[PDB]
Amino acid sequence: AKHVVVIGGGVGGIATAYNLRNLMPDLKITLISDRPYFGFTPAFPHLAMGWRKFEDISVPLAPLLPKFNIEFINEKAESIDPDANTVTTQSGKKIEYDYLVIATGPKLVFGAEGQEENSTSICTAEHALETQKKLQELYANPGPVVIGAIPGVSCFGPAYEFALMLHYELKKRGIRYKVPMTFITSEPYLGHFGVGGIGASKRLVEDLFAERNIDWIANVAVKAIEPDKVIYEDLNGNTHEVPAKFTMFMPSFQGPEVVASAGDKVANPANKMVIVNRCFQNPTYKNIFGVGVVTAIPPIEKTPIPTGVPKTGMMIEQMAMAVAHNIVNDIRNNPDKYAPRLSAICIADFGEDAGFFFADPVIPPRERVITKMGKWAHYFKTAFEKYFLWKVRNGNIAPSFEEKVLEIFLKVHPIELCKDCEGAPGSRC
Amino acid sequence: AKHVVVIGGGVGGIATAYNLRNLMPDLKITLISDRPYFGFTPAFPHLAMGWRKFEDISVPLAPLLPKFNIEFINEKAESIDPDANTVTTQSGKKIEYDYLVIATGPKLVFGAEGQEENSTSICTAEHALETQKKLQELYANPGPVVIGAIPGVSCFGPAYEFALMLHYELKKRGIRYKVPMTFITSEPYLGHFGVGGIGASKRLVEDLFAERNIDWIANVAVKAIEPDKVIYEDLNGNTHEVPAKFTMFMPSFQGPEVVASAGDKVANPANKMVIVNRCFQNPTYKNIFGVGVVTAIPPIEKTPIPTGVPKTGMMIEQMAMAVAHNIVNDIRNNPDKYAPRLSAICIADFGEDAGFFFADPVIPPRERVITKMGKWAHYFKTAFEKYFLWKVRNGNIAPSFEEKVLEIFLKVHPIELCKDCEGAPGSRC
Amino acid sequence: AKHVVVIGGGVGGIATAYNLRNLMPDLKITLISDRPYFGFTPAFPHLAMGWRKFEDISVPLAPLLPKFNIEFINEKAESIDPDANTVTTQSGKKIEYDYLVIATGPKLVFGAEGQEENSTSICTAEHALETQKKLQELYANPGPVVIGAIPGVSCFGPAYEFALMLHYELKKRGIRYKVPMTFITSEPYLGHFGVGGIGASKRLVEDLFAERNIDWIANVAVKAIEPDKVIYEDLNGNTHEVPAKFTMFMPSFQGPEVVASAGDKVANPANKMVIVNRCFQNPTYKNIFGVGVVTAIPPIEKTPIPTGVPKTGMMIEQMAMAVAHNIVNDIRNNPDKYAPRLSAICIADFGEDAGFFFADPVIPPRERVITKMGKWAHYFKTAFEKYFLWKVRNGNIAPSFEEKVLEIFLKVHPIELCKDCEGAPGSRC
Numbered sequence A, B, C: 001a002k003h004v005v006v007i008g009g010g011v012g013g014i015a016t017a018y019n020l021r022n023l024m025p026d027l028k029i030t031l032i033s034d035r036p037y038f039g040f041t042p043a044f045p046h047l048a049m050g051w052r053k054f055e056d057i058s059v060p061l062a063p064l065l066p067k068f069n070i071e072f073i074n075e076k077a078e079s080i081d082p083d084a085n086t087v088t089t090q091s092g093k094k095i096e097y098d099y100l101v102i103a104t105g106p107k108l109v110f111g112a113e114g115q116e117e118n119s120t121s122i123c124t125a126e127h128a129l130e131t132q133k134k135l136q137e138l139y140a141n142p143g144p145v146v147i148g149a150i151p152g153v154s155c156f157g158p159a160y161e162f163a164l165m166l167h168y169e170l171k172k173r174g175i176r177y178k179v180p181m182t183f184i185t186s187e188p189y190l191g192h193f194g195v196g197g198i199g200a201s202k203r204l205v206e207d208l209f210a211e212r213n214i215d216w217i218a219n220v221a222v223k224a225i226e227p228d229k230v231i232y233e234d235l236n237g238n239t240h241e242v243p244a245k246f247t248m249f250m251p252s253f254q255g256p257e258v259v260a261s262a263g264d265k266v267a268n269p270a271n272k273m274v275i276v277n278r279c280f281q282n283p284t285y286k287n288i289f290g291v292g293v294v295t296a297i298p299p300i301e302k303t304p305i306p307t308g309v310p311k312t313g314m315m316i317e318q319m320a321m322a323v324a325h326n327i328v329n330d331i332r333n334n335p336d337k338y339a340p341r342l343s344a345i346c347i348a349d350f351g352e353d354a355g356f357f358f359a360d361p362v363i364p365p366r367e368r369v370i371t372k373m374g375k376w377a378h379y380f381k382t383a384f385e386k387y388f389l390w391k392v393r394n395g396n397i398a399p400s401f402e403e404k405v406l407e408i409f410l411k412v413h414p415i416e417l418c419k420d421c422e423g424a425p426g427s428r429c
């Protein structure tokens, strides 16, 4: 009767726990999370826009997880002793494991001076709801809006979505002509996304912004967010300011102190993210796996202003699939190990229409991309929200038909047999 | 029995006078203009191309204006005394006013050395007719053509139209492959138009010029026009030259001496254009209004080579509606004041097809834009020409149906209630 | 009967010889070529891909040319004595002529250090076959690919074709995700082609490279190709390095030693190409004509990294028609002389689809361009290949219907009466 502990009750943690449970009924699974609910992160921009109720995009874990025989501990994990195979919670409870899955998501870094106090963010439900309050303040007395991403950001999509959604909302309110909008990014160009673009995404987003009168500044470092302005620095070292009554900036991500508490063989010395190989397994502690945003994946491109690689939902579901198979196979002494494909279907909701991006794989060189836009993509976004929430509530994040459908439509194979796990995650084995 | 004097028998003056007349049949209205005719400015490029007869795009005003009980004086206004509420003509007639509307249009400044003598222009009917004479010389003895805008230009559209029309003509004459064409502009890029661009106008005009082999140089200052060359200076201060048998350049605009004659409270000290507020009313002398190109509107953006804001026909028409309502409301002891929306439908005629640009408002931030191209837009431009000419001859520049049609097709409302006129024209109340 | 010697058994030489034969049945015509076959050059990229067999895109000349009363000498022409009106072959045979047509094609210069040794090329059948052999090694052991053009290149299309064909092949083999691809060119931008672009060719090729994940570097000078990497220099003089396991670079072109042997009135000092006027006749020796790539045509523009003008198939067929008429008219004491239009239909085959480019003329000012892309263009490329080879085998490179069909579809007339032959080739009479 083996014991896996999963740290984090989000996309990566839930998917891995559910996968493990469905692969191995005879396996003990403990999920530890500091939030009592699963939060559907792709709906956080909508929540900030006041287009969702929190209750409709979240799932209480305590009455749910026991239905699938998973023990839920609603506590923050404080430290990991990888030599002892132990996790210690904030309350001091020490829980021993045979396998550990770290899926804590991003630790948010508000790197611009004054950002956390003066700006808004949409990365958590709590921050999103705070943003909504500030937006109601904006509608009552319109002023300049600045949205974007600071240096080191690795999740750019929600910023683009939020900007376009806000444009949509101001337009519906008839006050868009009273609200200047500017997008400022650390990406070397619009639609880079920390992935070197997806097809002609640069041309697509530039045209989208031109059509919707969203001014933009790319390839710069946002250095300060003041109550009245945003200050950014270009590559020449020249500083510029842009007026702003309302701002929404993406923080950069780093790993949590719980990961840092394990050795420098577990926590990447540069960013505290979980050191993993191609099989998303720690190179030194073979019973530790990382799933999701918390995993240390090298940037696709060293950009003039530092940027990182996104870990999207599909990428994370593929990691979860690989990790679950990797743990089960180790338990059963099956030598087969899996690397996730790390392909992605991504949809950027703009209001009534949406951008559809497919990248296979996300990390270049690519076999295939799809870049489309239309109303259909918006409805697909909403439909997938309903679908995924159902999956969380029904104990299977990987129903057999889903993989078949993705294979039928997009030739996707989520995981590959990996003959040698040694190497950076995302590198081809 | 109140008295309004309108200076200028063009788009702004005629529109304001007609609006006032339809609003207030009992009002005394005197129109002062140095030209005996209304000239339909949007057909001056066509006139230059020899595609119009002068008689077909102009309306004699002396026989016409008495039909709508408007007094017409065919004289140049020489000076304005704002403290005496008087206007003096070149002969010496002192006309007293209760309200004054200044709508003298552009005073042309041929800022490049040799520009007035060696180049051509299409800004007046007289200038356009001379350009046709010079085009015949070009067809007879083919050589290099260069067209564009000098520094400080605010009306770029007709230069693009003219270039494309001339290409069209050259090609029809079978001499295009014998005539090099170069477009040189103070705009930071093609399709800036002095408005920071309209939707994807940059991309659109670039592709247009590329498909038609029109070479271009942007973001430079034309310094001299010689009989055989055009000299321009780049941002690095370096001088360059281009061969030219025929040229056509836009002059920059300033305010007239008649506006300068009034206070520095009326004449903008930097350009002699009329100081107006959001309601197109002088801040100091509240019975003075400005309508049209003569109004001092700040640049949308300060460009590397100085560039100013166009005042297009639709913009002028909205100014005229706003100013007419503001005068009448003052007469009727009504506190309600209006600002024009300053939206624009602009059609650049290219010959057989045309570019259609809609910006609402022209001064950002914008509610929406439409950028289209096709044969239909050329037929629309010709149709509108006939329509507007008819409106001039029939005494109503703003028939009720037109506002309703614009509303249902483009979501345009021409004027808005302004709670606080205090501010720059085009800035939001 | 008079005697014409044609040096070169390629597109230009065959076209001129056949044009002369059909114009003048009694004319004695001798063709001298070092290759025993006509090679269909536009199928050489396909030969390099292994998509053609050599015998399917070549025609043995010795048994063919006598059927058209053309004497074939399968020898390299070694020298030309223009004063004695003689050509000497490598074996020392002296051939006297009344008129001489020089059509020896490009002499290849592998200007980058280690290029001929470490890279591949597709400019001859023999080189393309070596490339095919090295490609097999890339599929077996996938790694970084870099393709492009060194400084002074004048034929860029085949590099674009080969890059996109290789992408197609790798995607066919399902190994494109293992092969980084980078395009490096002397062109100031993508789709310049040594002609200053064709319509929106830059925008088209950029979007295409983006859609297919082909990275690119333009406006640089490739200095060295090592087994390990490509070294290039930017315009600041800074050297850069890009990793490469397989490369394919275009060489630059010069003229041959046989041309150099005729002295500096015939051989251009800078490149050893044939000095010709508008009528493709040598200015000094009026009985010497040049046809094809070997002709000295000035560049369309001096680019920051030097590039030259392509001589495409259609341009060369037009040169051939003009030269044949010019020779025949001299014989018959007809003072009419012709210049080629020098327009170009260019199809860049990308595998399963293709880019269609049409420029009329290629050298600006242009009457028109067409830039299109689709599957249809690939099928036309294949169809044209079959059609041209048929024409070689059947003794008519200029069937009357082809000129009519080109007139109907593209409004092209291949040659024009030239009232003054004196001037640069491509300059307007």
Ligand SMILES: Cc1cc2nc3c(=O)[nH]c(=O)nc-3n(C[C@H](O)[C@H](O)[C@H](O)COP(=O)(O)OP(=O)(O)OC[C@H]3O[C@@H](n4cnc5c(N)ncnc54)[C@H](O)[C@@H]3O)c2cc1CS
Pocket (backbone or CB within 6 Å): A007, A008, A009, A010, A011, A012, A013, A032, A033, A034, A035, A037, A038, A039, A041, A042, A043, A044, A045, A075, A076, A077, A078, A103, A104, A105, A106, A122, A123, A124, A155, A157, A158, A256, A258, A291, A292, A293, A294, A311, A312, A313, A314, A316, A345, A346, A347
């Ligand atoms: C705003 C936003 C939008 C967004 N939209 C996306 C989209 O439309 N498509 C898509 O594919 N991806 C989108 N993403 C990215 C990504 O899918 C999300 O960031 C995921 O949520 C990432 O999943 P993870 O499992 O990596 O992280 P998580 O946040 O869902 O879950 C972490 C859980 O861990 C808990 N926790 C943190 N620290 C803990 C400690 N010390 N101890 C116990 N538990 C801990 C935490 O409470 C949570 O339950 C989008 C991304 C964004 C965000 S900026």
Ligand SMILES: Cc1cc2nc3c(=O)[nH]c(=O)nc-3n(C[C@H](O)[C@H](O)[C@H](O)COP(=O)(O)OP(=O)(O)OC[C@H]3O[C@@H](n4cnc5c(N)ncnc54)[C@H](O)[C@@H]3O)c2cc1CS
Pocket (backbone or CB within 6 Å): B007, B008, B009, B010, B011, B012, B013, B032, B033, B034, B035, B037, B038, B041, B042, B043, B044, B045, B075, B076, B077, B078, B103, B104, B105, B106, B122, B123, B124, B155, B157, B158, B256, B258, B291, B292, B293, B294, B311, B312, B313, B314, B316, B345, B346, B347
């Ligand atoms: C060449 C050209 C083309 C052009 N095309 C346009 C278009 O296709 N669409 C569009 O929307 N706008 C276009 N414009 C711009 C604008 O619509 C025109 O410039 C208007 O003509 C501007 O209207 P205004 O009322 O501002 O000026 P006006 O020139 O029409 O009339 C001024 C009248 O005043 C007289 N006048 C001058 N000075 C006087 C004194 N001192 N005293 C008495 N009267 C005076 C003058 O004679 C005239 O009747 C386009 C613009 C252009 C031009 S560059």
Ligand SMILES: Cc1cc2nc3c(=O)[nH]c(=O)nc-3n(C[C@H](O)[C@H](O)[C@H](O)COP(=O)(O)OP(=O)(O)OC[C@H]3O[C@@H](n4cnc5c(N)ncnc54)[C@H](O)[C@@H]3O)c2cc1CS
Pocket (backbone or CB within 6 Å): C007, C008, C009, C010, C011, C012, C013, C032, C033, C034, C035, C037, C038, C041, C042, C043, C044, C045, C075, C076, C077, C078, C103, C104, C105, C106, C122, C123, C124, C155, C157, C158, C256, C258, C291, C292, C293, C294, C311, C312, C313, C314, C316, C345, C346, C347
């Ligand atoms: C790889 C490649 C592709 C290519 N594709 C083209 C295309 O798709 N469309 C198009 O319009 N043009 C394409 N071109 C360019 C051009 O059409 C070709 O280069 C032509 O082959 C040029 O014709 P030429 O007659 O100029 O040259 P040639 O190579 O066909 O023939 C020369 C003949 O002369 C012989 N020869 C050389 N030296 C000699 C001496 N000293 N004595 C006697 N004979 C000599 C030689 O053997 C040959 O028979 C494309 C171009 C390319 C290539 S990079």
Ligand SMILES: CCCCCCCCCCCCO[C@@H]1O[C@H](CO)[C@@H](O[C@H]2O[C@H](CO)[C@@H](O)[C@H](O)[C@H]2O)[C@H](O)[C@H]1O
Pocket (backbone or CB within 6 Å): A370, A372, A373, A374, A376, A405, A406, A409, A410
């Ligand atoms: C159950 C299946 C779930 C698996 C997900 C499959 C992913 C595959 C998505 C890639 C294919 C895109 O899918 C399709 O793209 C086209 C091209 O823009 C869209 O666009 C099409 O329909 C719209 C609306 O009727 C038209 O205005 C448009 O002219 C037409 O091109 C379609 O509405 C969309 O259905």
Ligand SMILES: CCCCCCCCCCCCO[C@@H]1O[C@H](CO)[C@@H](O[C@H]2O[C@H](CO)[C@@H](O)[C@H](O)[C@H]2O)[C@H](O)[C@H]1O
Pocket (backbone or CB within 6 Å): B370, B372, B374, B376, B405, B409, B410
């Ligand atoms: C009744 C008077 C009109 C009031 C002015 C209203 C202006 C209309 C602006 C609305 C924007 C829609 O603009 C619309 O776009 C389409 C899309 O290319 C245009 O073009 C379309 O119709 C034309 C008809 O000749 C077709 O030949 C063409 O193939 C097609 O693309 C329409 O001609 C244009 O009307």
Ligand SMILES: CCCCCCCCCCCCO[C@@H]1O[C@H](CO)[C@@H](O[C@H]2O[C@H](CO)[C@@H](O)[C@H](O)[C@H]2O)[C@H](O)[C@H]1O
Pocket (backbone or CB within 6 Å): C372, C374, C376, C405, C406, C409, C410
């Ligand atoms: C019979 C021999 C005649 C050929 C002579 C050579 C001259 C060639 C002249 C080229 C004329 C223009 O080329 C023409 O472009 C259009 C694009 O709108 C192509 O049309 C293509 O694209 C459209 C839109 O994606 C598709 O729906 C269509 O099925 C496809 O064929 C035509 O297939 C092509 O023939």
Ligand SMILES: CCCCCCCCCCC1=C(C)C(=O)C(OC)=C(OC)C1=O
Pocket (backbone or CB within 6 Å): A042, A312, A313, A314, A315, A317, A345, A346, A347, A380, A381, A384, A387, A402, A405, A406
């Ligand atoms: C018959 C019911 C059809 C539902 C099955 C198809 C669901 C597959 C959705 C793919 C997808 C995944 C996995 C995914 O992770 C993701 O990111 C959040 C998407 O973007 C919205 C996706 O579209």
Ligand SMILES: CCCCCCCCCCC1=C(C)C(=O)C(OC)=C(OC)C1=O
Pocket (backbone or CB within 6 Å): B042, B312, B313, B314, B315, B317, B345, B346, B347, B380, B381, B384, B402, B405, B406
């Ligand atoms: C069905 C009846 C037909 C209604 C006709 C309404 C036409 C309204 C014209 C709008 C317009 C204005 C005001 C206008 O100023 C302008 O620029 C000069 C246009 O472009 C040519 C316009 O299209």
Ligand SMILES: CCCCCCCCCCC1=C(C)C(=O)C(OC)=C(OC)C1=O
Pocket (backbone or CB within 6 Å): C042, C312, C313, C314, C315, C317, C345, C346, C347, C380, C381, C384, C401, C402, C405, C406
């Ligand atoms: C019945 C229809 C008759 C079709 C006649 C064939 C048209 C001739 C092809 C034109 C052409 C020429 C001359 C040509 O030289 C060329 O470059 C190699 C092309 O690109 C593929 C061409 O398309």
